[PDB]
């Protein structure tokens, strides 16, 4: 066991990359949000005083639905959220999962087969290739996840939901919110993605130096 | 091997002159120009081995006899070269259809056999044959069918690849689409802006969808046919038209490429007569009558949308009216301003190209070969040119029609795959009880055998041979002659 | 689900144009340079024509898909 | 509203698409089997290669079955005269096209099995003719798929 | 149980095809792909409240597909053992 | 290349009889030469070397018979891959 390899600056970078994107996977893939609204129609008896909705991490929001009040005859109209950002959320989650698996494999190789990894610099070259690929993936995914988080905050926003709801277009109907989703998890995930991108960018130079191309 | 070569060599020397004329043997041979030095070096080896002091001597001589057709075939190009040679060995030094066939035969095959899954199966099979080719080449068998397929392994490989591509474009995989980017058809705007409700869903068995209301149709699918058409009962209504237009477009462009190749042939052979009467009249006729049809198809696609659906003209009727000069004041309106004048001009040019081909060339030939220098038979020449013009003009129509076999075979393959799926593995999938997972075993065994037999083997063979027929007739009648002789060298194949 | 007809057309046109135009200048020199160039150009032309026909045929639909009521009900929930 | 007899034409179209295709494929199979039996007494090694025309007759039968199944799954109680007669036309198209294609396949295969027995090179020519004979019935099926889903 | 190598090869190729295609079909059913809605064995009652019932039936069909894939995996293993025997 | 057929040309060779066999053997190995009948007046079955070709055919028959006995027996037939040239000198007597 070459624990000195882990303790070395490159090993520290690998350990940091393992902890990061794993923090991101935990923050994102475990995200579960709830929203609460209320509608008081012209007749109070038909008021939807409390309507609650829940959504998961994948952000397939267009699937999420709820039976809002119609304010006429006491009926209900099914309303769905607008747009989904799975293409970005799942992409970032998969990138983070792949990064975590690669970090675990690299740590295992350095601890056990560091000599084989360093042999002929072929392992350093493969590490440099993976580092460039991961840097590009992180650069794309950080922006994708930030845009997804902003647009999800917009779409899940009770203000926007009420504005789009046709109940407000009626006479006397009043729609209000009760709670908003916790954006702390999404913000932390975005910050962790940016940190992982920075770590990969920094490790690019370390890999280049190790491979001798410096 | 020793005795077989010895026999072959003596039988070859039989063909050479004998001492009845000279003690030194006389040999006559065809040879490519570049290999003359190599042949001389081979003769030098022969002299050294025989020990004869005198050296054998080779000599060129300007000739009149027709040289053979030699194509310097390769391992990858052997299948395609045999494929194009089947319908007649090309003449000496004319545009060879093989290099273009190398792609257009797999592509035309894929336009019909288009299916992602079946293409995957075919490319895997062709890759197995390619990889294990040395093994099978060593282990020879008498199975004619298998020998044919193996010789065509590269043909099958390219056919599989292009079939994969066309299956992706059709969004077809074992009769089922993919939806990898997301459909442009959203059903919610129908209830939001449109006039629907759960009551309408209960009341209508099949209903329908419209893109006129804003959010239903969010642009075209970025790559291939939209997945929703797979589940739409309106599938055929749209696929039929799209595939008919595709078939006509591809056929007309292929024929135009053939005519350009014919121009190349004439330029190389130095037949300005053919270039100025023949090709140019032919290309003008073809483009004006049928290329204009492709332009019309593309223009209608780009112009007419849902809002203008009501008064969207039918290009079939418009082409009929173009030919009949039957532009009416009632019915579907004109596609674009000036259609009457432009179409009349196009028809006039098209019909003028018939006299252009027919009358001109015979008259110039008769002039410059019977009034100058003074056997030429003017009546026979006129009859021959009339036959050629009638043949070409009727051929344009009949070939643009026959290229519809692309759509016919594609739709047939798609419908046969759909019915096979729904009649075989729908049985194993539409079972509530978990015990169905065991039934799916045998049901899918039947599905696999049926796909390999009915579809991969027989429908694939039909599509292959119809791409072949298209290439032989529709494409190659424009520039190919195929009145040469295969170069059969004195090469030792007794290795068998 | 808004599928703009700018990104797909630009991406596919540039990709197939590269394959069919730049690739002939990159093919290595040898006996098969001509045949390989022909395959590159012909594949570019054919594949691009097929894809363009498909995308245009889908563009500007004069009628929408006809979906059974069960599948319309399911698609409302699932698809965007 | 609609006549109680409106479904008769659709039912008969499905029945025709099946029956006439079956008759054409039966003729193809019978003629090809006669040719194969006559040939095999001298060239036993060509039976498997020469079994192709029988397979193409089976393919004609398969087209007939497909169109019959489509029409039979499209029949409904309130089937209007329009749909009923569309399905009748599709059935007639498939049935008669498969009938004629099967006749041609049977005759050509009976000729070409014996011919290939004598001249090995004739096998590919026989296959070439047979594929045309089969796509005749395919054209019938194509028109049927256009009609029954008009 | 010795048998013909041709039959063993056919069995193994069919096993590979079945495993791959049925695994993909199960994955798609589990993802609830709307393309395969016709293959779900649902009834009129399943359209009562929401899509959860149809999702459950999708999952059931996916389980059937995975069971078939596992059976074909066993069949391919038997064919591979027969090949090793031959 | 495959664009169009190769430039083709006739040629005629004077070669002394003694070395003619070896020279045509080298040509056969090379494979880029196509001879033509230059004595079509007399049929093939009467040409000069018909005696030689007849004896070669008899040798081929002998080899076919021995090979058939080989197949009848379980003994296998080797495969080296060498392609030696027929001996131009009168090694036919030794082979016979
Ligand atoms: C798991 C299954 C996956 C699917 C795989 C099968 C896909 C279905 C389509 C395959 C069609 C195969 C035919 C084309 C290949 C032959 C072309 C070629 O390159 O050879 C030149 C062939 C044969 O090669 P050749 O012997 O001429 O080679 C040249 C040799 N010299 C120069 C010495 C003469 O040449 C021709 O005669 C050209 C005409 C070919 C026309 C093809 C006719 C149809 C043949 C049908 C084959 C049998 C049907 C399938 C049965 C399967 C069951 C065992
Ligand atoms: C799935 C979606 C995509 C589908 C559409 C694209 C399909 C393209 C199909 C062509 C690819 C396969 C080519 C054959 C591979 C086997 C090689 C055989 C032997 C070989 O090297 O052939 C040479 C001919 O050139 C060659 O082998 C040609 C190689 C280079 C061709 C480049 C053109 C490829 C297509 C365009 C680019 C890709 C587009 C899709 C992304 C000459 O034979 P030899 O010297 O070895 O012979 C040895 C004895 N004489
Ligand atoms: C080897 C290759 C051989 C050739 C292959 C190609 C086939 C060639 C066919 C013949 C020549 C080209 C076609 C000529 C016929 C007219 C084509 C009209 C196309 C069309 O629909 O355009 C609309 C009309 O254009 C207008 O409104 C403008 C006026 C009408 C058209 C003017 C002529 C344009 C073509 C010029 C010749 C091109 C030659 C190509 C070889 C666009 O108009 P819109 O929708 O905006 O208007 C509508 C409201 N008013
Ligand atoms: C509207 C849709 C349809 C459009 C189709 C027409 C437009 C595309 C084709 C236009 C012509 C392209 C260029 C022609 C060849 C010019 C010669 C130089 C080409 C080049 O750089 O490569 C040389 C090899 O070319 C060669 O060996 C020959 C290359 C020939 C390229 C064209 C063949 C594909 C056309 C068919 C399209 C597919 C069918 C459409 C349905 C290298 O020079 P080198 O050293 O090899 O010297 C030559 C002898 N060896
Ligand atoms: C022997 C050699 C081996 C042969 C190999 C053959 C492989 C064949 C495997 C497939 C066969 C079955 C075909 C079924 C295809 C339908 C599956 C499908 O549609 O996929 C995609 C769906 O999951 C997703 O789409 P959705 O959930 O509707 O929408 C959500 C999609 N967004 C998020 C992108 C918008
Ligand atoms: O989309 P849709 O399918 O709904 O219809 P569309 O009109 O909008 O688009 C279809 C476009 C295209 C025209 C559809 C292609 C369909 C064709 C049926 C026929 C092509 C064959 C031709 C042009 C030659 C054979 C002769 C045929 C009529 C007779 C012409 C000759 C004379 C009158 C002497
Ligand atoms: C009623 O239905 C028609 C026909 O589809 C539609 O155009 C119109 O917008 C609808 N009116 C409403 C929902 O008020």
Curated annotation (Swiss-Prot), chain A:
Residues 5-212 form the MARVEL domain. The chain crosses the membrane at residues 10-33, 92-115, 123-146, 185-208. One of its GO terms (molecular function) is SH2 domain binding. It is found in: Cytoplasmic vesicle, Secretory vesicle, Synaptic vesicle membrane; Synapse, Synaptosome. The modification Phosphothreonine is found at residue 211. The calcium-binding activity is thought to be localized in the cytoplasmic tail of the protein. This is Synaptophysin. It comes from Rattus norvegicus.
Curated annotation (Swiss-Prot), chain B:
This is V-type proton ATPase 116 kDa subunit a 1. It is found in: Cytoplasmic vesicle, Clathrin-coated vesicle membrane; Cytoplasmic vesicle, Secretory vesicle, Synaptic vesicle membrane; Melanosome. Keywords: Cytoplasmic vesicle, Hydrogen ion transport, Ion transport, Membrane, Phosphoprotein, Synapse, Transmembrane, Transmembrane helix, Transport. GO terms for molecular function: ATPase binding; proton-transporting ATPase activity, rotational mechanism. Residues 114-115, 178-241, 301-345, 415-435 are vacuolar. Subunit of the V0 complex of vacuolar(H+)-ATPase (V-ATPase), a multisubunit enzyme composed of a peripheral complex (V1) that hydrolyzes ATP and a membrane integral complex (V0) that translocates protons. V-ATPase is responsible for the acidification of various organelles, such as lysosomes, endosomes, the trans-Golgi network, and secretory granules, including synaptic vesicles. In certain cell types, can be exported to the plasma membrane, where it is involved in the acidification of the extracellular environment. Required for assembly and activity of the vacuolar ATPase. It comes from Rattus norvegicus (Rat). The modification Phosphothreonine is found at residue 66. The chain crosses the membrane at residues 95-113, 116-132, 148-177, 242-261, 280-300, 346-365, 390-414, 436-474. It comes from the Eukaryota. The lineage of its organism: Eukaryota, Metazoa, Chordata, Craniata, Vertebrata. It is a multi-pass membrane protein. The chain holds residues 295 to 832 of 838 of the full protein. Residues 133-147, 262-279, 475-496 are cytoplasmic.
Curated annotation (Swiss-Prot), chain C:
It is a multi-pass membrane protein. The keyword Ligase does not apply. Residues 1-6, 56-80 are lumenal. Residues 28-34 are cytoplasmic. It is found in: Membrane; Cytoplasmic vesicle, Clathrin-coated vesicle membrane; Cytoplasmic vesicle, Secretory vesicle, Synaptic vesicle membrane. Pfam families: ATP_synt_H. Keywords: Cytoplasmic vesicle, Glycoprotein, Hydrogen ion transport, Ion transport, Membrane, Synapse, Transmembrane, Transmembrane helix, Transport. GO terms for cellular component: clathrin-coated vesicle membrane; synaptic vesicle membrane; vacuolar proton-transporting V-type ATPase, V0 domain. The chain crosses the membrane at residues 7-27, 35-55. Belongs to the V-ATPase e1/e2 subunit family. V-ATPase is a heteromultimeric enzyme made up of two complexes: the ATP-hydrolytic V1 complex and the proton translocation V0 complex. The V1 complex consists of three catalytic AB heterodimers that form a heterohexamer, three peripheral stalks each consisting of EG heterodimers, one central rotor including subunits D and F, and the regulatory subunits C and H. The proton translocation complex V0 consists of the proton transport subunit a, a ring of proteolipid subunits c9c'', rotary subunit d, subunits e and f, and the accessory subunits ATP6AP1/Ac45 and ATP6AP2/PRR. This is V-type proton ATPase subunit e 2.
From Swiss-Prot, chain D:
Residues 29-50, 110-126 are cytoplasmic. The chain crosses the membrane at residues 6-28, 51-71, 88-109, 127-147. Expressed in brain (at protein level). InterPro entries: ATPase_proteolipid_c-like_dom, ATPase_proteolipid_csu, ATPase_proteolipid_su_C_euk, F/V-ATP_Csub_sf. It is a multi-pass membrane protein. GO terms for biological process: negative regulation of autophagic cell death; positive regulation of ERK1 and ERK2 cascade; positive regulation of Wnt signaling pathway; synaptic vesicle lumen acidification. Ubiquitinated by RNF182, leading to its degradation via the ubiquitin-proteasome pathway. It comes from the Eukaryota. Its main location: membrane. One of its GO terms (molecular function) is ubiquitin protein ligase binding. It is found in: Cytoplasmic vesicle, Clathrin-coated vesicle membrane; Cytoplasmic vesicle, Secretory vesicle, Synaptic vesicle membrane. The record marks 134 as: Essential for proton translocation. Disulfide bonds: none annotated. GO terms for cellular component: clathrin-coated vesicle membrane; membrane; proton-transporting V-type ATPase complex; synaptic vesicle; synaptic vesicle membrane; vacuolar proton-transporting V-type ATPase, V0 domain. Residues 72-87, 148-150 are lumenal. Belongs to the V-ATPase proteolipid subunit family. This is V-type proton ATPase 16 kDa proteolipid subunit c.
């Amino acid at each position: 066991g070459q624990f000195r390899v882990v303790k070395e600056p490159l090993g520290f970078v690998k350990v940091l990359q393992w902890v990061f994107a794993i923090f991101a996977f935990a923050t994102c893939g475990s995200y579960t949000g709830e929203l609460r609204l209320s509608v008081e129609c012209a007749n109070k008896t038909e008021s939807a005083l409390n309507i609650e909705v829940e959504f998961e991490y994948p952000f397939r929001l267009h699937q999420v639905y709820f039976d809002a009040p119609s304010c006429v005859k006491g009926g209900t109209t099914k309303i769905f959220l607008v747009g989904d950002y799975s293409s970005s959320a799942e992409f970032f989650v998969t990138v983070a999962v792949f990064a975590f698996l690669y970090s675990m494999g690299a740590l295992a190789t350095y601890i056990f087969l560091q000599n084989k990894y360093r042999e002929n610099n072929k392992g350093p070259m493969m590490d440099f290739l993976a580092t460039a690929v991961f840097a590009f993936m992180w650069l794309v995914s950080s922006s994708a996840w930030a845009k997804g988080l902003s647009d999800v905050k917009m779409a899940t926003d009770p203000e926007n939901i009420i504005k789009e709801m046709p109940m407000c277009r009626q006479t006397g109907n009043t729609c209000k919110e009760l709670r908003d989703p916790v954006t702390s998890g999404l913000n932390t995930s975005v910050v962790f993605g940016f940190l992982n991108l920075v770590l990969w960018v920094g490790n690019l130079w370390f890999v280049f130096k190790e491979t001798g191309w410096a | 091997i020793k005795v077989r070569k010895m026999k072959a060599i003596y039988h070859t020397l039989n063909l050479c002159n004998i001492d009845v004329t000279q003690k030194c043997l006389i040999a006559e041979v065809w040879c490519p120009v570049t290999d003359l030095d190599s042949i001389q070096f081979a003769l030098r080896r022969g002299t050294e081995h025989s020990g004869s002091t005198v050296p054998s001597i080779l000599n060129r001589m300007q000739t009149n006899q027709t040289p053979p057709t030699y194509n310097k075939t390769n391992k990858f190009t052997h299948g395609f070269q045999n494929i194009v040679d089947a319908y007649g060995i090309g003449t000496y030094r004319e545009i060879n259809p093989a290099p273009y066939t190398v792609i257009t035969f797999p592509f035309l095959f894929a336009v019909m056999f288009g299916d992602f899954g079946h293409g995957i199966l075919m490319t895997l099979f062709a890759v197995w044959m390619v990889l294990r080719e040395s093994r099978i080449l060593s282990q020879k068998n008498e199975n004619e069918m298998f020998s044919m397929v193996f010789s065509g392994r590269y043909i099958i490989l390219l056919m599989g690849l292009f079939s994969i591509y066309t299956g992706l474009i059709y969004n077809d995989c074992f009769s089922k689409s993919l939806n990898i980017f997301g459909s442009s058809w959203s059903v919610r705007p129908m209830f939001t802006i449109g006039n629907w409700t759960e009551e309408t869903l209960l009341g209508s068995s099949v209903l329908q969808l419209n893109p006129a209301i804003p959010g239903v149709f969010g642009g075209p699918y970025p790559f291939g046919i939209d997945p929703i058409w797979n589940i739409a009962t309106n599938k055929l209504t749209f696929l039929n038209s799209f595939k008919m237009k595709m078939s006509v477009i591809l056929g007309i462009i292929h024929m135009l490429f053939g005519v350009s190749l014919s121009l190349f042939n004439h330029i190389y052979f130095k037949k300005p007569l053919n270039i100025y009467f023949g090709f140019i009249p032919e290309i003008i006729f073809m483009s004006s009558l049928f290329g204009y049809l492709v332009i019309l198809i593309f223009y209608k696609w780009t112009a007419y949308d849902a809002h203008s659906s009501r008064n969207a003209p039918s290009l079939l009727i418009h082409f009929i009216n173009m030919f009949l000069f039957s532009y009416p004041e009632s019915g579907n309106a004109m596609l674009y301003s000036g259609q009457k004048g432009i179409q009349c001009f196009l028809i006039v040019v098209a019909m003028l190209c018939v006299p252009w081909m027919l009358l001109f060339k015979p008259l110039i030939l008769r002039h410059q070969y019977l009034r100058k220098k003074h056997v030429f038979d003017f009546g026979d020449t006129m009859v021959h040119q009339a036959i050629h013009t009638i043949e070409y003009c009727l051929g344009c129509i009949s070939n643009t029609a026959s290229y519809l076999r692309l759509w016919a075979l594609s739709l047939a393959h798609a419908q046969l795959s759909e019915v096979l799926w729904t009649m075989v593995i729908h049985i194993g999938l539409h079972v509530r009880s978990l015990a169905g997972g065991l039934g799916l075993f045998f049901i899918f065994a039947a599905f696999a055998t049926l796909t390999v037999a009915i579809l991969l083997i027989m429908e694939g063979l039909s599509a292959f041979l119809h791409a072949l027929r298209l290439h032989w007739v529709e494409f190659q009648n424009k520039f190919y002659t195929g009145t040469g002789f295969k170069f059969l060298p004195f090469s030792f194949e007794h290795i068998r | 689900t808004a599928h703009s007809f700018a990104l797909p057309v630009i991406i596919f046109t540039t990709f197939w144009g590269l394959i069919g135009i730049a690739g002939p200048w990159f093919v290595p020199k040898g006996p098969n340079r001509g045949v390989i160039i022909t395959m590159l150009v012909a594949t570019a032309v054919c594949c691009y024509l097929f894809w363009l026909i498909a995308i245009l045929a889908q563009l500007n639909p004069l009628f929408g898909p006809q979906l059974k009521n069960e599948t319309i009900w399911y698609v409302r929930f699932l698809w965007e | 509203n609609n006549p109680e007899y409106s479904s008769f034409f659709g039912v008969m179209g499905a029945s025709s698409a099946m029956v006439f295709s079956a008759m054409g494929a039966a003729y193809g199979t019978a003629k090809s089997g006669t040719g194969i039996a006559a040939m095999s007494v001298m060239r036993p090694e060509l039976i498997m290669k020469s079994i192709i025309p029988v397979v193409m007759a089976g393919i004609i039968a398969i087209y007939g079955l497909v169109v019959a199944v489509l029409i039979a799954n499209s029949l409904t109680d309130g089937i209007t005269l329009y749909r009923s007669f569309l399905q009748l036309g599709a059935g007639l198209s498939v049935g008669l096209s498969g009938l004629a294609a099967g006749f041609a396949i049977g005759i050509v295969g009976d000729a070409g099995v014996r011919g290939t027995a004598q001249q090995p090179r004739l096998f590919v020519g026989m296959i070439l003719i047979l594929i045309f004979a089969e796509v005749l019935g395919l054209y019938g099926l194509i028109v049927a798929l256009i009609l029954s889903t008009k | 149980l010795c048998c013909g190598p041709k039959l063993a090869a056919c069995g193994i190729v069919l096993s590979a095809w079945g495993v791959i295609m049925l695994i993909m079909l199960g994955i798609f059913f589990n993802v609830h792909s709307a393309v395969l809605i016709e293959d779900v064995p649902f009834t009129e009652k399943d359209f009562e409240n929401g899509p959860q019932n149809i999702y459950n039936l999708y999952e059931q069909v996916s389980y059937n597909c995975f069971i078939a894939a596992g059976l074909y995996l066993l069949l391919g293993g038997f064919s591979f053992c027969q090949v090793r025997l031959n | 290349e495959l664009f169009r057929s190769e430039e083709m040309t006739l040629a005629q060779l004077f070669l002394q009889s003694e070395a003619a066999y070896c020279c045509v053997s080298e040509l056969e190995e090379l494979g880029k030469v196509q001879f033509r009948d230059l004595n079509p007046d007399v049929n093939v079955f009467q040409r000069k070397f018909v005696n030689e070709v007849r004896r070669c055919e008899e040798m081929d028959r002998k080899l076919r018979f021995v090979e058939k006995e080989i197949r009848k027996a379980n003994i296998p037939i080797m495969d080296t891959g060498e392609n030696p040239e027929v001996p131009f000198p009168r090694d036919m007597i030794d082979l016979e």
